[PDB]
């Protein structure tokens, strides 16, 4: 039973080695956004007569 | 070196609180000994192993 014991205690302590890391890269990254329409920004004026 | 005293910090706590759960691996005789200034067993006991 002593001997048990101490074999559980040693295998803990194995047990205890980290296998690796994961994690998520995003940084730097932004969403785009989608304009619909063109800016102009051109106006006809003309005089009534149309000369 | 950080690494070798953290590594070495968690696996003491580990073998101890092992050693400590279901019928204790040390006899009561011991744990009177090492309780005789006023600590708990289980730190008497990390206390030696170390």
Do not use: C
Request: aromatic content about 4%; hydrophobic content about 35%; glycine content about 6%.
């Amino acid at each position: 039973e002593d001997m048990a014991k101490i074999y559980g205690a040693v295998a803990a302590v194995s047990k205890n080695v980290n296998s690796s890391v994961t994690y998520e890269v995003k940084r730097g990254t932004h969403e785009l956004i989608k304009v619909p329409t063109i800016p102009h920004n051109l106006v006809l004026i003309q005089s009534d007569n149309g000369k | 070196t950080s690494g070798s005293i953290i590594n070495h910090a968690n696996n003491l706590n580990k073998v101890i609180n092992h050693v400590f759960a279901d019928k204790p691996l040390i006899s009561e005789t011991m744990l009177k000994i090492l309780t005789i200034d006023g600590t708990t067993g289980k730190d008497g006991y990390r206390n030696w192993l170390d």
